[PDB]
Amino acid sequence: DCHLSDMLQQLHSVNASKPSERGLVRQEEAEDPACIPIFWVSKWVDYSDKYGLGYQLCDNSVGVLFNDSTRLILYNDGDSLQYIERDGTESYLTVSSHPNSLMKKITLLKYFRNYMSEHLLKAGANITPRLARLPYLRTWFRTRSAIILHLSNGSVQINFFQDHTKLILCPLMAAVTYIDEKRDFRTYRLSLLEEYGCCKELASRLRYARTMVDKLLSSR
């Protein structure tokens, strides 16, 4: 994929600049407001053992990547749907049209939504949000330390288990959004982090992110 290789040059470049090793870190100068992601995953559910991965995007919409490789999205109007077949074909339905062939998949997805509503906290419920198309989870994996979520607008998001820190990388804006342990949000242009450096926390997570993209390319 083009975007994934684009993101690999961006991440390496920023890492080979050793931004945590500057004389004085001027991280704050690296911030670009024009680079704030339009979409990120706020909540997610790993029912992969029987059904697949359900997630919530920041706009309150939800989606599932089923085990049969199919995909379904529910918009924030709570009725409008998008179904994407295994072989990539998209289509638009309402829930209330009652398609018999999708009721199971509707119900499944509805469970997911209901569940993240009562049982999970919204990651980045604060972030100031910065017109674009609504993406689906292209693919995902988890390791021992994080879960990686690869969206179809090019974006890759990473959520570390240890301490709740998260990354939203966009290869189009060539920008990274870091979410620290206090749920504070900041967006950076990767090349300005090269120039003005950054703290040891963000640098070490960007060093990790690059390995995860090496994992995505290897499995794509």
HEC sequence for the chain: CHHHHHHHHHHHHHHCCCHHHCCCCCHHHHECHHHCCCCCEEEEEEECCCCEEEEEECCCCEEEEECCCCEEEECCCCCEEEEECCCCCEEEEEHHHCCHHHHHHHHHHHHHHHHHHHHCCCCCCCCCCCCCCCCCEEEEEECCCEEEEEECCCCEEEEECCCCCEEEEECCCCEEEEECCCCCEEEEEHHHHHHHCCCHHHHHHHHHHHHHHHHHHHCC
d(CA 72, CA 82): 6
Buried residues in 60-70 as b, exposed as e (16+ CB within 10 A): ebbbbbbeeeb
Amino acid at position 215, single letter: K
3-state secondary structure 141-154: EECCCEEEEEECCC
Tokens 């998001």 -> residue: 157
The distance in angstroms from the start CA to the end CA of the chain is: 7
Tokens 């609504």 -> residue: 134
Hey, CA dihedral for 15, 218, 57, 44, is it positive or negative? negative
Tokens of 199: 């703290």
Cβ atoms of 70 and 86 within 8 Å: the answer is yes
Cα Rg of the chain, angstroms: 18
Q: How many CA atoms lie within 13 Å of 119's alpha carbon, on the beta-carbon side?
A: 9
| Domains delineated in the chain | 1-41+135-220 (3.30.1120.30), 42-134 (3.30.1120.30)
- What technique was this entry resolved by? X-ray
Give me the phi and psi of 195, to 5 degrees please: -85, -45
Tokens of 97: 């049209």
> Resolution of the deposited coordinates, in angstroms?
2.8
d(CA 200, CA 204): 6
- Spatial CB neighbours of 15, under 8 Å, sequence gap ≥ 6: 203, 206, 207, 210
d(CA 67, CA 6): 28
Amino acid at position 177, single letter: T
